[PDB]
Write a protein that binds this ligand. Structure first.
Ligand SMILES: O=C(NNC(=O)N1CCN(C(=O)c2ccco2)CC1)[C@@H]1Cc2ccccc2CN1Cc1ccccc1
Length: 122
């Protein structure tokens, strides 16, 4: 399965599944800076799933590793901002992260395998 480009549509489909998850609600759009007035004191680099989808559609990811780094930033930001581990929004982040990790692993493995096949004789 050595298609170097296949990751992009696989990531579009996984983003569609994440948008169908009720657990993505808080992460779809930027953290509301009016409601959380201290957010940018705590979080240096905001990230959300709409920004990830637009960056993919613009052709501004070169690999699924770069997409994965941005999605993992959504989850680390939630963990850094939460006042407690039993918070609703952080709790949603942990379930959504587990879902994401379960489905991104084959996308990353197939991409890295395809690149190694491309260089097999170099
Ligand atoms: O909620 C939102 N965005 N993000 C945050 O405000 N968050 C709070 C902070 N945070 C944390 O990680 C965290 C950890 C512990 C505590 O917070 C990330 C999440 C946005 C805001 C917004 C503004 C203007 C119009 C619409 C919306 C939609 N909203 C959600 C939504 C999405 C789809 C449908 C219904 C509602």
């Amino acid at each position: 399965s050595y298609d170097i480009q296949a990751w992009k549509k696989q990531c579009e489909e996984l983003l569609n599944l994440i948008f169908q998850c009720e657990d993505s609600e808080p992460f779809r759009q930027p953290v509301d800076l009016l409601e959380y007035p201290d957010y940018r004191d705590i979080i240096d680099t905001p990230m959300d799933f709409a920004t990830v989808r637009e960056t993919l559609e613009a052709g501004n990811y070169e690999s699924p590793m770069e997409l994965c780094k941005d999605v993992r930033l959504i989850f680390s930001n939630s963990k850094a901002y939460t006042p407690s581990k039993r918070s609703r929004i952080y709790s949603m982040s942990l379930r959504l992260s587990a879902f994401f990790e379960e489905h991104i692993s084959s996308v990353l493995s197939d991409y890295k395998s395809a690149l190694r096949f491309h260089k097999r004789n170099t």
